[PDB]
Structure 1
Amino acid sequence: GEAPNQALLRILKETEFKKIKVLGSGAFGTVYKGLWIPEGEKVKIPVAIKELSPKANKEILDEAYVMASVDNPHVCRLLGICLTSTVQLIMQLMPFGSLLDYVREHKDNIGSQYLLNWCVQIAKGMNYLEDRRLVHRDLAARNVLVKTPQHVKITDFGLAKLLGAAAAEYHAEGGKVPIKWMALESILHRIYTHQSDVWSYGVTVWELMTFGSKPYDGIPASEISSILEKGERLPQPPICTIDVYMIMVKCWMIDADSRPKFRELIIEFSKMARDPQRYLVIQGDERMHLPSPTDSNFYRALMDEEDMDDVVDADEYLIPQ
């Protein structure tokens, strides 16, 4: 928390990438699917372009600072920023959307092996963020993106906060935060730690184990803190053995120091990933398959471009400016 942050902020020309379609709009702004072509390089990189006004440019550049400071296979990569009227965040395109939408659409072909492996990767990413003293404050299935069915990464650092040295927690001021993923101490006292991210990790796992069910469905956020304070929690999903449900309940304990560490969640879920049918009970588990075409034909349909001979995923484009 005291070392100098010598990350490179890369400025990209607007001319060298093309918007193609709207992937989504909302409170976060708008996200476009696009192709980035660094002139000189015989390369086409599939990218996602996020736009959020003086107040907007500050918040965008705060997220850019955070994303430019992380480099992990299970955290999403910031490729650079573009200095238009409103600043654009250029990020790596995750061609399969959010893990929440993925498990909802493919609920009938998702096996226990995939579910448990996603839990490992998400915990690997969150453990890396803890190593960097970064509290995400918005971990949820909607903020886990699918590069391939076997590879997911964490996104949306709009609420992320770097804990300065000798600061063990972040105290927020007001703001709109998703109540149903927040730890109780965050709801009541606006205190955020890496252990409050663990609470959100448990809700995220619950989202996956229910194939994308909404937590506390049909209950107003007004009543969430009242529910948890009385000792009520999310129910045991049908496919979950007590082994898996016990891990979720440990993430939702009142004492934040009694919750597991992301380190330990990696170990536990990786152990279960070696005998998946012993911990998740899914009918037809042995006959499930999820397609991940890395063919050059796959990108021609995704990017709506006939020629994709030079397509390079952002994870293979490491060439500096």
Structure 2
Amino acid sequence: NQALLRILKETEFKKIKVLGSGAFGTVYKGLWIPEGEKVKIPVAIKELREATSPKANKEILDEAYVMASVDNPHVCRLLGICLTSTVQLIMQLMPFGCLLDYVREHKDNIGSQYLLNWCVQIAKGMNYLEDRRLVHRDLAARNVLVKTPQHVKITDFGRAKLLGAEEKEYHAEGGKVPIKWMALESILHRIYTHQSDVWSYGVTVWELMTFGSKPYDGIPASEISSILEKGERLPQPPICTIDVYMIMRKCWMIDADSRPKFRELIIEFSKMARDPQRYLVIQGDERMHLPSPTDSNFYRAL
């Protein structure tokens, strides 16, 4: 029904193994066995790094209630929290990992229908975040996760920020940033908006359409703002029709107001997803197959 934050005790879940780690902390594959409920639920557990100045439990719970309220099919949901000496966030497990690695591993069998459906889903998730006044600030194929080959979800590792009712921008402080996914105004001035998220969406789409290529490969991050100001952009992927590439280019306009809105991106990519082979040209497209629950019905995977 309605998405609410569950408070878990250490007795109710178990970390099984490490999946990955970063500045944020460590993420584990885990099991949630809710007290009294007699059910066992695979989950992802994020145990956050110990901060120099740990927030009070009250502060943490307030933030967690807001993040738990984020409830959309294409955003990975926070299911519960456990506060002890550490903060552990219990998330939906996305069994197939990140979309970036998925498209690199399965590129020989990824057709136009899947690529365009993923673009739609990511746009829907981002539009929902915008409706919630959340600026993501790290959208990229590595941060979209795969529930099934047919269904992906945007995830957040701590960079997302909630804007106030009258705030149209987040002003960031120093630190490491994903330069090659960022809008010019973010690179130069540390300014983030829903429209700088749109820039990152464009780069994410480019990643997908090149089956996981690195943007501006071999170019130093420090040179990126210079090339953008000269007007250079990521090139047309070979499988993309001009129509698709033009949407992507609109995401990278210098004037943030000239970029598309996520609501518009949903409409345009939804149109294309309805006739995928008109908009993406992939050799052997009609023959390509990814694992689907209908495989048995159609006698695939013999």
In 2: Cα distance, 1:298 partner to 1:81 partner:
42
Cα deviations across residues 213-241 of structure 1 (Å, max 9, x unaligned)?
11111111111111111101111111111
- Once the two structures are TM-superposed, the CA of residue 186 in structure 1 deviates from its matched residue by 0.7
Partner of 2:114: 114
Q: 1:195 to 1:8 in 2, by over 3 A?
A: same
Cα deviations across residues 236-283 of structure 1 (Å, max 9, x unaligned)?
111111111101000000111100000000010010111111111111
In 2: Cα distance, 1:51 partner to 1:267 partner:
38
Structure 2: gaps (5+ residues)? none
In 1: Cα distance, 2:28 partner to 2:300 partner:
17
Larger displacement relative to structure 2 (158-167 or 21-30): 21-30
- Once the two structures are TM-superposed, the CA of residue 35 in structure 1 deviates from its matched residue by 1.1
In 2: Cα distance, 1:235 partner to 1:62 partner:
44
- Once the two structures are TM-superposed, the CA of residue 180 in structure 1 deviates from its matched residue by 0.6
Structure 1 residue ranges, 4+ long, deviating more than 3 angstroms after superposition: 5-9, 55-66, 292-302
Q: 1:30 to 1:209 in 2, by over 3 A?
A: same
In 2: Cα distance, 1:16 partner to 1:296 partner:
37
Q: RMSD between aligned alpha carbons?
A: 3.8
Larger displacement relative to structure 2 (46-55 or 249-258): 46-55
Conserved in 1, the CA contact under 8 Å of 2:182 and 2:199? yes
In 1: Cα distance, 2:271 partner to 2:192 partner:
29
- Once the two structures are TM-superposed, the CA of residue 288 in structure 1 deviates from its matched residue by 1.0
**TM-score when normalising by structure 1:** 0.85
Conserved in 2, the CA contact under 8 Å of 1:19 and 1:33? yes
Larger displacement relative to structure 2 (6-15 or 242-251): 6-15
- Once the two structures are TM-superposed, the CA of residue 63 in structure 1 deviates from its matched residue by 6.5
- Once the two structures are TM-superposed, the CA of residue 156 in structure 1 deviates from its matched residue by 1.3
Partner of 1:177: 177
Structure 1: gaps (5+ residues)? 303-321
Cα deviations across residues 270-319 of structure 1 (Å, max 9, x unaligned)?
101111111111111101111146999999999xxxxxxxxxxxxxxxxx
**TM-score when normalising by structure 2:** 0.91
- Once the two structures are TM-superposed, the CA of residue 18 in structure 1 deviates from its matched residue by 1.6
- Once the two structures are TM-superposed, the CA of residue 64 in structure 1 deviates from its matched residue by 3.3
Q: How does 1:234-273 map to 2 (within 5 A)?
A: 234-273=234-273
Cα deviations across residues 26-77 of structure 1 (Å, max 9, x unaligned)?
2232111111111221211110001127379999768635522311111111
Q: 1:109 to 1:299 in 2, by over 3 A?
A: closer
- Once the two structures are TM-superposed, the CA of residue 166 in structure 1 deviates from its matched residue by 1.1
In 2: Cα distance, 1:155 partner to 1:49 partner:
13
Q: 1:155 to 1:301 in 2, by over 3 A?
A: farther
Q: 1:227 to 1:174 in 2, by over 3 A?
A: same
In 2: Cα distance, 1:86 partner to 1:191 partner:
31
Q: 1:100 to 1:62 in 2, by over 3 A?
A: farther
Q: Aligned residue pairs: how many?
A: 298
Structure having greater relative contact order (Cα 8 Å, sep ≥ 6): 1
